[PDB]
Structures are given as structure tokens and as C-alpha cells.
Amino acid sequence: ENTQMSEAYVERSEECSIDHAKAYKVHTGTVQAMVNITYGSVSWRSADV
Amino acid sequence: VVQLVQSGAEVKRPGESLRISCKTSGYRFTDIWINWVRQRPGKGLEWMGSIYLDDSDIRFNPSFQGHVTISADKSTSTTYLQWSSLKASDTATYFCARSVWSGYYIGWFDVWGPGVLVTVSS
Amino acid sequence: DLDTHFTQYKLARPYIADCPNCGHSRCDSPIAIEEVRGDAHAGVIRIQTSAMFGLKTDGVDLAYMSFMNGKTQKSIKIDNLHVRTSAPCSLVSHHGYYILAQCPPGDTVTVGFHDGPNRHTCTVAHKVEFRPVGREKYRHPPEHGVELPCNRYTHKRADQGHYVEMHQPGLVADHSLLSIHSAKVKITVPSGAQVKYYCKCPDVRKGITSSDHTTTCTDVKQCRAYLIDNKKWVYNSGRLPRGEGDTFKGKLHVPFVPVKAKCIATLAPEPLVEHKHRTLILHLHPDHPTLLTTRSLGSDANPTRQWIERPTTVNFTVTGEGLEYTWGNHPPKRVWAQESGEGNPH
Amino acid sequence: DLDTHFTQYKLARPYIADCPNCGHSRCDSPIAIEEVRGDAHAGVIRIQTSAMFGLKTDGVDLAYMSFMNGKTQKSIKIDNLHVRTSAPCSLVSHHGYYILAQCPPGDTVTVGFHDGPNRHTCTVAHKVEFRPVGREKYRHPPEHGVELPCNRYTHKRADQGHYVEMHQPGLVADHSLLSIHSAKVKITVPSGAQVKYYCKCPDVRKGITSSDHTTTCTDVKQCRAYLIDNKKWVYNSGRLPRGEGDTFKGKLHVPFVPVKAKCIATLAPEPLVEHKHRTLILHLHPDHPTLLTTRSLGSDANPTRQWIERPTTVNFTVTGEGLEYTWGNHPPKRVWAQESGEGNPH
């Protein structure tokens, strides 16, 4: 025959949309917090800062 | 429930042409062979032809070329039988039968039309 | 849902693909196995066979199966459709070409259905593993514990997230529809296919709907009939010959797709903490291989991670800044230890 | 074929010798497992039993099975001959006293055949291993790979290479054909056996066809009757008594003699070669525990062989003489390296 066509190629799997490892690059970015403050007679009050 | 519905009983004379139809209901696949068979009054049956709904693949009885023709329409999902010139021998009952695709063979005829009765005479 | 099943009826048929070890040897089986996907955690797997479960010759009728017994798509009742890996799996569902089942770990995957005189088995060599969630290596979904997020094959009948291709089937070679008429080969077209034929010398390379008998060949052994049909499609499988139908990249939803769910994970026996000051003794009594991971809460984390497989006693050094330890599926615990009174400064 | 069964029928009969764990407790079953033979490569084993498969009571009719239930060889259709070691085996052939199956790895061998009211199972403690061919330890034959020379128990029905012995059967003890006629023992000869018997005082030690009775005592408990027959022979099982007549060494061909054959062995994935000059880095990513063997091509081989079972990276210092490495079942490869461009002499 002198013939056969094995044809294979890679692609994403069905689990790729459910379990994948993402590769992030990182820079310094920012830093924040959320404080809770009281002073004198005013009750506790909190806020992101 | 699946049903086959044909045209009403027809009365005609020889010489002119005639059109009859069979229509499918209760089925949502065009994957089906629909076939035309004739019963002479008081005699047995004889398969005339068969048409596959998807691509209009024609299987035919070899004594009816030209005298009969089969076609189909997809918007209504129906099959159409044509006589270009009737003859006295065409007075008979005509049945459309439903054979779902079951491989490389026509298979078996699940449900049938009630049967159109055509009377051609002089 | 049934609309997806009906759309799977539109052009999909069973096919006889090559299967290794059809019981005891290689063959071409009505129910082949291709791309068994054991990737879930609890143990569920999905096997894409070469037979249409559900679909009978007329409708859906979930309790029916269909397969190609030669030239005929034949439908029967699903009387005993079994899947074995190393012990009988409890099949959870079936739709189209796909079975979804719950198998134990093993080195093989085999499917089989009863026609009543025949068993039509197909066995592929595919390592499938139990994949427990969390930090404990259990070997069966436990009765109790804690729910953790896992990825399992949904038992839902359908979903449009993922697809697979449909292609026109390749011309199916055959010789059983070749006979001898008087002393000459004869090609018996099965009344519904345009049988191509190739024989001794070059012949008509398109076939004809009418029965034929060629004079350039006398014995069947130099003549063969490619039975073809362009009315039903097949999923392009690596084990079938590709025809000239290089059009119609048809689409099918994949029935059981991986989705997130909640899997039970074993809560290991609680350890005995002996907080003798300046350190922390931990007696651990696992029942499965469990994890113990600890870290110091100071400038030097100094992590320590190990798999405890049997009863053990481990001593950690709790300084005045803090230690944290997590054991099994338990939440992390923290301990700060100092101020021991050993000695007397006075 | 057809004549080997005939030659095996000329004097051979089934028997009830012995089998431990026939069900749950040791008993005397018509399927007495003896001489399990697992020495082939891809898991095919040949079991030997005491039932006579393949031939009927009158002809052969390959799909039948004659076994002795008491004092009558009875033939039944083979409904399902199930063989297991740690999971169900796929029996592939049977003939005479022998079955041939493709069992998975395990540590037991249990055979059984249904009769319809009862099961007649028989288990034995035998160690059956799966022997991978070549240099890669796969755990089940694959669908593709390299074609290596293995040895298998042939599926051929007929052969004349090896033989086993059949002998005149020993005395078959019995008490059931011992009734009380009026007040004395009475031995009921079963119309064709010159049943021996022995009672309180030494009675006639030769037996007689006519139904005898003796007035030595009135208790059956102190007299036994040995059913005896010289018209059908049995394989000289160690689990059967030997007849006093030390005659008739008889040959019985062993059907499924071992033969050299061609098995399919796994081909390991292609390794990643990094020919960094003055050495050679090899990243190996196996899926089964294969082995890598390397050796220098100079005046000293300097060999190194190691079983790789997980992804690893190995560094081999190839000199100008060369180095030959072969990985798994792949063909050997050879690399020569020198003339590195590090630095310049100007």
C-alpha cells in the first residue's frame, strides 16, 4: 500500500477549564489594611485604609 | 405520537397527471426512509419506491420508471408521488410507510399512512 | 435532557472499531474503548465507547442500547452492561458514546454488554488511580469527614461547555457481499448503499447502486467491496479509516464534563498534645497516610512537612514568637510557648 | 481439532479427588484443582482440574463438559466456566483436564462451573505473577509497542510434544451401597462393579458382582465397600489412592504445551537528550518502571544500569571513545563527543 496517515496533535483537555495552574508575575504593588478605632467615648468603628 | 397523514381519496380519468403526498408528524428527525407501496383491490402488495428524507436518495422498483416519480420537501418534511400520465391500471390503494434508518438496509416499516384510494377509470 | 439526546440522534451511529483483547485476543468489536478519562478525585471515570447507549432504532428510551452488528444498527434492552477495573464498577450513567462509572483503582479498564448469546467485551490497558482530596490518602469516599472542593465528572445528562467532532464515515471495506454468479464475481449491493468495488485491474472507482458482476475478475480473492453510506455520520476515531468526506466538522456536546463539587475527606484522629514548656510533643495515631505540616511564625519560617503513615511521636520547638501546625484535614492550630519556670534566678 | 479429544476419551474419566476452600471449607469436589501452571509472560496461565471439558458422554461436541457426580459421569453444557485470581479471568480454551485462561496478577486461583442448582467452586493458594517482556514493567499487554520474543501456553487444541500419565484408578471407598436387609449388612453392587468389601472379621477380599450379604455383624458402621472399576482410567493424581495392580502407564497428550511466540512490549516515551559538550544530560519521563543501561565504548565498559520509575535526569560523561546507552525497550543509541569550544589557545 505504501500508505498510512498517523495524525496526532495536542490540545486542551476538558479538565483544563476546571483545574489549571496560572503563572503570575509579581511586582511590588500596594499594601493596605482594615483598622478598628475607638477614642474617648465613641464606640468602635472600623474601615478599610 | 408519530403519525403519517396522506391526501384524501382521489377520483380521476386516464390521460392527465396526478399528485399525492405523505406527511410525517410526531417525529423531529428527517433521518428516515419513507416508502410508497401499492395494493391492487383484493390482491397483495408491491413495493413501488423509497426515498430517504435527508438527501432524497431514491430506491425504485424496476417496472415503474417514468410512469411514477418520487420527490420530497424539507420545510414540511413530506414526500410527493407523481404520475405524469395515468393509466387504467393505477386504480388502487397507495400506502406510505415509515422505516427508520437501521444500517445499510431499508429495515422495517414502523408506521403507515391510513392509505390513499385513487380511482382512475373511464 | 432529551433535546440533546435527540440532537445526538441526528447523524450519530455506532461503529465497529478495533479493540485489543476482546476477551482473549485482538478484534474489531461493536463496543470499542477510546480515551478513557480517569481524572476525577472520588474515583469516577468516563469511557467513550463505540456504541450508542440510550438511543434505540426509533427514539431515546433510556433503558435501551444500540450497536452495529455488522451492516445493521441493532437496538436491544440494556440487560447487563458492566465495567471492570479490578472489581465490578457501579456504572452511574450512560449517554451516547459515553459511560460514566465509579471504579476502584487498577491497571485495566474493560466494558461489556450482554446480547444473550454473546458478551461483546472490550478491555484496554489504562492505569486508573484513586485520587483522594485533601491532605489524607484515603482509598474510598468516607462515610463522614469534611467537605472539600473537588473536581468530579458531573452526572448531568448534558452540557454545552465542551464538544467533540463528527466526520463522514470512511468507506467500510467488505467481502461478504461478494459472491459467484455462475463463474464470475458478483457484487450484491445491500439496497441502500452505493458499494464501491476494486478488483484485479482498475475498475469503476465510484460504485453503482445496481448489482454488478465484472468480467475482468473470476475469483473473489482479487475483488472487494467498499460499503459506504452518507446518511449517518460517525465520530472521527483514530481506529477507523478516514474517507474522502473531508467536510462537515460536525459537533457533539460531551455529556459528562468535569465540574466542581464537594468531596468528603477523612478527619484523622485528633493528636495527643503534650505541651511540656519550651517545646511541644505530638503523638499522632493515623489510620491512613496523613500529612503534618508545621511552620514557625517568626522571621525564619523553618517549615517541616512529613507524611505520617503509622503511630508516631514528634517533638517541635515552640519558641516565644509562635508555632503553627496543621495535621490532616483539620484547620491550622497555633501555639505560643514560653515563661517556663525551670531554675530560680534568686 | 477432532482426533485429540477422541484419543483422550479412549480411557479417561473425571474423578472427585480433593480441593481446599471449595466454597468456604475443605471438601471433595468434582473440580479438584491440581498443578496450576503460570510461567508464561503476558499473564496467560494453564490450569489443570479433575473435570473433563470439551467432550461429552457419547461424542465430543466441544461446548460440553463431563464431570463425575458420585458414581455417574454426567455431561452438561458449559454455562459459564469462571476463573479468578484477584479478578475474573477470561478463559480462552479448554480440553480434557486442562483450561487455559488470561488471568490478572494475584495470589489465588479459583475455578468454578455452574450446574443450575449448585455452584461447585474450588480455590487454591497459588502465586500467579504478571511477567512483563523486555526491559519495561508494564502491568497489562498494550495495544502497541515493540514485538519481542516471549513464551506462551499455546491456544492450539492438539499437540504431541509433552505427555502426562494415566493409571488404573485406585479403590473408590463407599458406605452408601450398604443397607440393612432384615438384620444384617447387605452390599448393593451397582450393576457393573465387582465391589470389594471389608467387615469386622476378614471377609471376602476380592468382591463379587452379585449383591452379597454377610452375617458377621448387624452394623454397617464396621464394614466398608470399595467401588472398583477397570473400564475407565484416571490421571495418576496425588490426591487419589493407587490401585494394587501396578500396571498401565498410559500416555495422555498435554494440549496447551508452551511455545515461543511474539508478545507486544511497551515502548518508553522518547527521552529529552541535551548534548551539552563534554557530557550528556538525559531527562527521562517514564510511565512504567523501565531501566536504563549505559556503557563506555573504550577499553573499559564502565557500565551502569538502573531502574527508572519516575521522571529523573541523569548525567553521563561521554569521552572521545564514545558511549552507548539503551533506554527501556528502545534500540541502543551511541554518542561520541569531544572538541568543546571552551576558551581559545590564542
Swiss-Prot record, chain A:
It comes from the Viruses. Class II viral fusion protein. Fusion activity is inactive as long as E1 is bound to E2 in mature virion. After virus attachment to target cell via host VLDLR or LRP8/APOER2 and endocytosis, acidification of the endosome induces dissociation of E1/E2 heterodimer and concomitant trimerization of the E1 subunits. This E1 trimer is fusion active, and promotes release of viral nucleocapsid in cytoplasm after endosome and viral membrane fusion. Efficient fusion requires the presence of cholesterol and sphingolipid in the target membrane. The chain holds residues 897 to 945 of 1239 of the full protein. This is Spike glycoprotein E1. It comes from Eastern equine encephalitis virus. It is found in: Virion membrane; Host cell membrane. N-glycosylated. The precursor of protein E3/E2 and E1 form a heterodimer shortly after synthesis. Processing of the precursor of protein E3/E2 into E2 and E3 results in a heterodimer of the spike glycoproteins E2 and E1. Spike at virion surface are constituted of three E2-E1 heterodimers. After target cell attachment and endocytosis, E1 change conformation to form homotrimers. E2-E1 heterodimers interact with host VLDLR or LRP8/APOER2 to mediate viral entry. Interacts with 6K protein. It is a single-pass type I membrane protein. Glycans are attached at residue 36.
UniProtKB/Swiss-Prot annotation, chains C, D:
The chain holds residues 323 to 668 of 1239 of the full protein. It is a single-pass type I membrane protein. Residues 1-346 are extracellular. Glycans are attached at residue 315. The record marks 155-157, 231-232 as: Interaction with host receptor VLDLR. This is Spike glycoprotein E2. It is found in: Virion membrane; Host cell membrane. Plays a role in viral attachment to target host cell, by binding to the cell receptors VLDLR or LRP8/APOER2. Synthesized as a p62 precursor which is processed by furin at the cell membrane just before virion budding, giving rise to E2-E1 heterodimer. The p62-E1 heterodimer is stable, whereas E2-E1 is unstable and dissociate at low pH. p62 is processed at the last step, presumably to avoid E1 fusion activation before its final export to cell surface. Interacts with spike glycoprotein E1. Processing of the precursor of protein E3/E2 into E2 and E3 results in a heterodimer of the spike glycoproteins E2 and E1. Spike at virion surface are constituted of a trimer of E2-E1 heterodimers. Interacts with 6K protein. E2-E1 heterodimers interact with host VLDLR or LRP8/APOER2 to mediate viral entry. Interacts (via E2-A) with host VLDLR (via class A repeats); this interaction mediates viral entry into host cell. Interacts with host LRP8/APOER2 (via class A repeats); this interaction mediates viral entry into host cell. Palmitoylated via thioester bonds. These palmitoylations may induce disruption of the C-terminus transmembrane. This would result in the reorientation of E2 C-terminus from lumenal to cytoplasmic side. N-glycosylated. It comes from Eastern equine encephalitis virus (EEEV). Disulfide bonds join 19-122, 22-27, 89-103, 150-263, 199-223, 201-217. It comes from the Viruses.
